[PDB]
């Protein structure tokens, strides 16, 4: 069956249109999660190259970055019982669940250190959550299945791989964090023939 | 070590330029300055997107804007290869990178196609322009008979998807969609590997 890359091309174009109306963070997340919902509902477009689990670390595959680094679209792929560290973003983010099962535990900086702010959010294909400095920026995403891999498409208000942000230890101390990317090549979504 | 930052900085600068909603005259003038800065140094283009094919000239997409405002393409000619006579129907900038190639501009006359001028002889660093306004029809071809030739083309669209035309000797249009030779683009956005 032929890969429907047009889905990703159309998402990027729509998200470009959105950010050229110079909107506020409240409106970007509200309309953005609608567009990301439309993308991750169908699992027939992500090239197999950017769905591959590594057995040592979770993989971060860049799919597209805006010319002006306004935004970026990244495929995160967790192998069985893998996890991100506790981390912030320092920009608006949208996590769209695509394949498998993973949980997102939100965190807050308290006196004692890190305190989990709420119950682990349980994501199934199609579900879209948000993160930002304004609404709650610290979390930990991890694969719920112990045998299957899990994939989600993340969208950020920057080139997320180059952002100077932080991971957090139990006592609540920051360490500098630049995530980078797992791929040396992006997919060509622009050949409409 | 590949200086991909050069291409990242060009794309960002060209993004800034087009968000000031400038006229075609100003885009070409400031654009050819930025493209000049890129193609003067030949230490950034990944080898994967510099490969000649022995049958047809290769068109490798390096970057496309989110809104399809512009695209940056590596064109690679093998020995004694050539494009057909073609138009663009958008503003274009051809930056010469490696080897030697000539660009013969054309005009549609009564008899058909007549070459409008002498073949423009491009050497590494040289930047020319094309558009409907200033002269849209040309033919780019490798001047060397043994070396390959490469130039970085920048267009005011996603050039591979534009419905444009090739031209035959008698001057008759055939529809033309060029597409791209590559299934993968280079990742110019991982700054943490420097
Ligand atoms: Cl506390
Ligand atoms: Cl003409
Ligand atoms: Fe995150
Ligand atoms: Fe051309």
Numbering used by the authors:
A (entry chain C): 4 to 196
B (entry chain B): 5 to 198
Question: What did the published study say regarding this structure?
Answer:
Because intrinsic structural differences between Av3MDO and Pa3MDO are expected to be small owing to their high sequence similarity, we considered the possibility that the observed active site differences could arise from the bound substrate mimetic in Av3MDO. To test this hypothesis, we identified alternative crystallization conditions to allow investigation of the resting-state structure of Av3MDO. Following further sparse matrix screening, we identified a crystallization condition containing a nonpolyacrylate precipitant (pentaerythritol propoxylate) as well as sodium thiocyanate that produced yellowish, rod-shaped crystals. The crystals diffracted X-rays to ∼3 Å resolution and belonged to space group P6122 with a pair of dimers (same conserved interface described above) in the asymmetric unit. Strong difference density in the equatorial positions of the iron center was adequately explained by two water molecules while the axial position contained an elongated difference peak that was too strong to represent only water or chloride. Placement of thiocyanate, a well-known Fe(III)-binding ligand present at > 0.3 M concentration in the crystal mother liquor, at this position adequately accounted for the density with reasonable refined B-factors. Analysis of difference maps and refined B-factors provided strong evidence that coordination is through the nitrogen atom, which is consistent with the coordination preferences of Fe(III), a hard Lewis acid, and small-molecule crystallography results for high-spin, nonheme iron model compounds. Contrary to our hypothesis, we observed that the active site has maintained its closed state in this new crystal form. By contrast, the conformation of Trp81 is identical in every copy within the asymmetric units of the two Av3MDO structures, suggesting it represents an intrinsic structural difference as compared with Pa3MDO. A notable finding from our structural analysis of Av3MDO was its lack of a patent tunnel for substrate diffusion to the active site. This observation was consist across all crystallographically independent protomers of both Av3MDO crystal forms.
